[PDB]
């Protein structure tokens, strides 16, 4: 038990130390982000430790990618072999076609979960962040205060506890 060091972090460091191929490391990082890093995360078990473990996985994946790729690939491809530019353009198009703010939030959050570095090159990912965030802020802040808290609670799908 500890704020900065504990059993969960140690076990996850041991688990990370045994990733040897870039494919397995990238798959583990993607699964970890899906399971533990968003409001839409599958479980809040690692709430106190998930950021540090995510950083450790990111370091391992980054080193493995730098080893596996060449310079052009390291600049222009994601860890799974996709073209970063094509992925970025597709995500931006889907966001531009988004109808309401709920879909836009889902698209932006899924993009962050699936393609956050070191999965995607930083240049492409931050450009996508720029465009997607612009769109999402435009959709969200339009008529911000019109919906009453009761209807907003229903829309967000929250269970009112007290």
């Amino acid at each position: 038990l500890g704020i900065h060091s504990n059993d969960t972090r140690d076990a996850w460091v041991n688990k990370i130390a045994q990733l040897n191929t870039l494919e397995k490391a990238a798959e583990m990082l993607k699964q970890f982000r899906m399971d533990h890093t968003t409001p839409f995360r599958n479980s809040y078990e690692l709430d106190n430790d998930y950021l540090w473990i995510e950083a450790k996985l990111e370091e391992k994946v980054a080193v493995l990618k730098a080893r596996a790729f060449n310079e052009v690939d390291f600049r222009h491809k994601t860890a799974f072999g996709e073209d970063a530019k094509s992925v970025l353009d597709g995500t931006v198009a889907k966001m531009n076609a988004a109808k309401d703010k709920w879909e836009a939030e889902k698209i932006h959050i899924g993009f962050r979960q699936a393609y956050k570095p070191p999965i995607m090159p930083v240049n492409y990912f931050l450009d996508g962040e720029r465009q997607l965030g612009t769109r999402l802020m435009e959709l969200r802040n339009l008529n911000y205060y019109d919906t009453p808290l009761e209807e907003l609670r229903k829309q967000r799908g929250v269970r009112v506890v007290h």
Binding site: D47, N48, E138, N141, L149, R153
Partner: protein
């Protein structure tokens, strides 16, 4: 063979607007809802050299002042203990605010398209670096020369134990850099600076002078000399986005959110630090708050932006309704949690109780009764085996943390706002203290995920948490934080360990 001639900063700034050139990718790198105009001008015509000269003059005055006369006078020692403890928090929190202002102004400089607006933002970036180092130097000086160095010398790592630090971080760290660059400008410049930070600096100098502190006036007046340019920068931002339809769509929403964000934390915390962290009182916090918000900012400053569509925040009425008792409740909660701070807190004495009763009628029967009960139970005596959190637990008065503002609140015992909202979303429960933060979270849940102290420390003994985070003094046993400001009978980590106070998450009971 001519008259001696030189070129000044104005004759070079005259041609600065032409420096930027147009190419395909000449746009801001950050997400934003507004388009800043590219013909914007700046009020102050400064180049790098002239700005350096102006700042160097002020720096030489302040440091010559600090190193000769103030040191010879023992001005760093002859300060009331309560104010010495208060300046730890004040200086370090202002330092974090200025540091994040550096990054916020960097983002704003990225956003601006006119070269003159960029120049203004860059001048403010250098100014925020200067202010960061000035606040750090206030802590530096009070550590080298003060009556109690602990907390001054390691605030940058002991800030992280206590709950007030999270709210401070949100207002002056995350609210400044996380979001739309125009929203960040509104938090930092339009609201943070015009409404709170500048009158805060002036009032801090007043209160510090009242309590024998001459180091803080010396540093903070020099800090405040730089604020005209930053206020102009905020005005220029609002002007530059004033011609865009996006402004009509979004600017009032952004301004209201920024105002509520800043006020929600600077209403209780500032008043608590003033009235409870000082021996000699200058002015009741209610009057100062009313003058700052309704008079100086809400009436005059916000009125000056009426021509650009800016309206007075819609939550201003709610802020006023909640601004009367906020700092008293926050001090109840902060004293109940004295072990988790990096500063020594003092119970109100008889003179302070009389002043509180005179200025806040009805203060006694609630707050004074609680404090006198705590004193009669030995909250100050290490052998008592009592910390006020024990009283909170015995009386069924849970202490929650707002999921958005990070401000601790006790709805079942507060005199001000006493509304609690608990929601369960995806296996997690979030507690909110007001409707505005609740709307903020429901609208964008992914922005607000900070874990509170009751979750990080859940199931952990208080002494273990204090020991792990280095909340001890140089001797290795005595705590940095104390329930009093006297020099004897200080609490040790063994005194905390004997209590056996284990942190719990208040929301689990639901």
């Amino acid at each position: 063979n001519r008259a001696p001639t030189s070129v000044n900063a104005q004759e070079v700034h005259r041609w600065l607007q032409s420096f930027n050139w147009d190419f395909k990718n000449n746009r801001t790198k950050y997400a934003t809802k507004y388009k800043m105009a590219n013909e914007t001008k700046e009020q102050f015509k400064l180049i790098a050299k002239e700005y350096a000269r102006m700042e160097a003059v002020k720096d030489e005055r302040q440091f010559g002042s600090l190193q000769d006369a103030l040191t010879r006078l023992n001005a760093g020692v002859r300060v009331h203990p309560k104010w010495n403890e208060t300046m730890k928090v004040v200086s370090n929190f202002l330092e974090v605010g200025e540091y994040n202002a550096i990054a916020a102004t960097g983002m704003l400089w990225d956003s601006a398209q006119a070269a003159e607006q960029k120049n203004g933002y860059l001048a403010q970036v250098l100014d925020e670096i200067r202010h960061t180092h000035q606040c750090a130097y206030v802590n530096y000086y009070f550590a080298k020369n003060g009556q109690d160095p602990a907390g001054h010398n390691d605030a940058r790592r002991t800030r992280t134990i206590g709950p007030l630090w999270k709210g401070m971080k949100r207002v002056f760290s995350d609210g400044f850099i996380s979001g739309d660059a125009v929203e960040c400008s509104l938090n930092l410049q339009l609201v943070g600076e015009a409404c709170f930070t500048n009158p805060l600096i002036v009032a801090v100098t007043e209160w510090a002078a009242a309590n024998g502190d001459e180091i803080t006036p010396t540093v903070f007046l020099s800090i405040e000399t730089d604020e005209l340019r930053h206020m102009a920068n905020g005005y220029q931002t609002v002007v530059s986005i004033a011609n865009d339809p996006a402004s009509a769509k979004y600017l009032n929403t952004d301004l209201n959110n920024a105002f509520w964000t800043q006020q929600k934390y600077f209403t209780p915390v500032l008043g608590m630090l003033f009235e409870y962290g000082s021996k000699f009182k200058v002015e009741p916090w209610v009057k100062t708050w009313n003058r700052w918000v309704y008079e100086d900012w809400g009436g005059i400053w916000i009125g000056r932006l009426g021509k650009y569509g800016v309206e007075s925040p819609r939550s201003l009425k709610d802020a006023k309704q909640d601004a009367y008792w906020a700092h008293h409740d926050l001090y109840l909660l902060a004293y109940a949690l004295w072990p988790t701070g990096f500063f020594r807190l003092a119970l109100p004495d008889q003179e302070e109780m009389e002043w509180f009763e005179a200025n806040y009628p009805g203060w006694y029967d609630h707050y004074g009764k609680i404090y006198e009960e705590w004193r009669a139970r030995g909250c100050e005596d290490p052998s008592s085996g009592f910390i006020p959190l024990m009283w909170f637990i015995e009386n069924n008065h849970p202490i929650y943390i707002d999921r958005v503002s990070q401000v601790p609140f006790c709805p079942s015992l507060a005199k001000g706002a006493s509304t609690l909202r608990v929601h369960e979303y995806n296996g997690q429960m979030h507690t909110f203290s007001d409707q505005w933060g609740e709307r903020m979270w429901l609208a964008e849940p992914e922005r607000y995920e900070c874990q509170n102290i009751f979750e990080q420390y859940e199931g952990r003994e208080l002494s273990e948490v204090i020991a792990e985070l280095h909340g001890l003094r140089s001797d290795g046993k005595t705590l940095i934080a104390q329930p009093h400001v006297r020099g004897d009978k200080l609490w040790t980590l063994d005194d905390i360990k004997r209590l056996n106070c284990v942190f719990k998450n208040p929301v689990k009971a639901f």
